Amino acid sequence: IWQHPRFAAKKRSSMVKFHCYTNHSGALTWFRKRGSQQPQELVSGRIVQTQNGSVYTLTIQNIQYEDNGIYFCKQKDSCGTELLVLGF
Amino acid sequence: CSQIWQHPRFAAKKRSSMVKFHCYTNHSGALTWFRKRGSQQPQELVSEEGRIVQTQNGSVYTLTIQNIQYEDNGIYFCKQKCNVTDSCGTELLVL
């Protein structure tokens, strides 16, 4: 599955959006992996998952240090996005 | 808005050796190479005094690290204007 961006760097409190594109439409869902731990499936004013055609968008509001990690989508898989938080 | 193919995904090489990376895209947009090392952040690739060379042939853009130094351990990907697309990139490991 095609996902964008590859990398992403934002300041604590900001927001971001990850996009997963796919014409093969089944059941899509996002995950978050921290380091070498097992990926935990994402669940939704903090985490918003949407869809519009072949486009699926993950949104992360009020970002924060405990959000660094890789975000990828799976569908009945992508290389995902790595998020690095910053601050002020 | 394109989806860039790239090869390889991973590459392990001994210090002072050479590697080529390839990404393909028929989309006309301006393509450029990036490097994300450690916890820094991506950086448009540098001339490297001519150690790192960027060639191209048709739709096949190539990156070539010569005499690989331990300092090149990272992820190398292509960025293309269109939004703007990225490729999954290559993980280079220096042994």
UniProtKB/Swiss-Prot annotation, chain A:
Residues 1-88 are extracellular. Required in cooperation with CD79A for initiation of the signal transduction cascade activated by the B-cell antigen receptor complex (BCR) which leads to internalization of the complex, trafficking to late endosomes and antigen presentation. Enhances phosphorylation of CD79A, possibly by recruiting kinases which phosphorylate CD79A or by recruiting proteins which bind to CD79A and protect it from dephosphorylation. Coiled coil: none annotated. Residues 1-76 form the Ig-like V-type domain. Phosphorylated on tyrosine upon B-cell activation by SRC-type Tyr-kinases such as BLK, LYN and SYK. It comes from the Eukaryota. Disulfide bonds join 20-73. The chain holds residues 46 to 144 of 228 of the full protein. Glycans are attached at residues 23, 52. B-cells. The transmembrane helices of CD79A and CD79B chains and two IgM heavy chains assembly in a four-helix bundle structure that appears to be conserved among different BCR isotypes. The lineage of its organism: Eukaryota, Metazoa, Chordata, Craniata, Vertebrata. Heterodimer of alpha and beta chains; disulfide-linked. Part of the B-cell antigen receptor complex where the alpha/beta chain heterodimer is non-covalently associated with an antigen-specific membrane-bound surface immunoglobulin of two heavy chains and two light chains. Interacts with LYN. It is found in: Cell membrane. This is B-cell antigen receptor complex-associated protein beta chain.
